[PDB]
Write a protein that binds this ligand. Sequence first.
Ligand SMILES: [Cl-]
Ligand SMILES: [Cl-]
Length: 162
Amino acid sequence: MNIFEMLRIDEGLRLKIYKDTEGYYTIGIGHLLTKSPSLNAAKSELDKAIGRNTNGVITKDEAEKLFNQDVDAAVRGILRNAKLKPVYDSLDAVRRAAAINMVFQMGETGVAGFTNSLRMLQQKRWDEAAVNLAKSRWYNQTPNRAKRVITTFRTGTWDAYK
Ligand SMILES: [Cl-]
Ligand SMILES: [Cl-]
């Protein structure tokens, strides 16, 4: 198991524009296109992202390409963030994948606001962090996925994904 397979399981793969859990225009493996209500604004962003006139549909390769870029950007966002980096550096390889997952889903700002959980992870207080992480809108909105990520932080294994 690795970050890619992990996210592929949490996000699915869709080759036609769709709405995400929050109602936003998305395509591929969790690639947010726009928060605007316009399918056209979404269509425009899509073409801009792929480099061609797609009519709202992409191929699997295109999807994977977006995915590769998004994982990369996620990692780099963590590494550039003064609040995230230190926590991330302190973690083991499995837990790091859980961190990437959160950022991929909620953005670096989003994560950055979990100050208390962050401190707990950094101190390696696993059960405590797990409990604190659950007290969040994130958990309440996407509980099954949240549970998976949280278990990963708690145990340090890929058991939730097996
Ligand atoms: Cl893009
Ligand atoms: Cl869920």
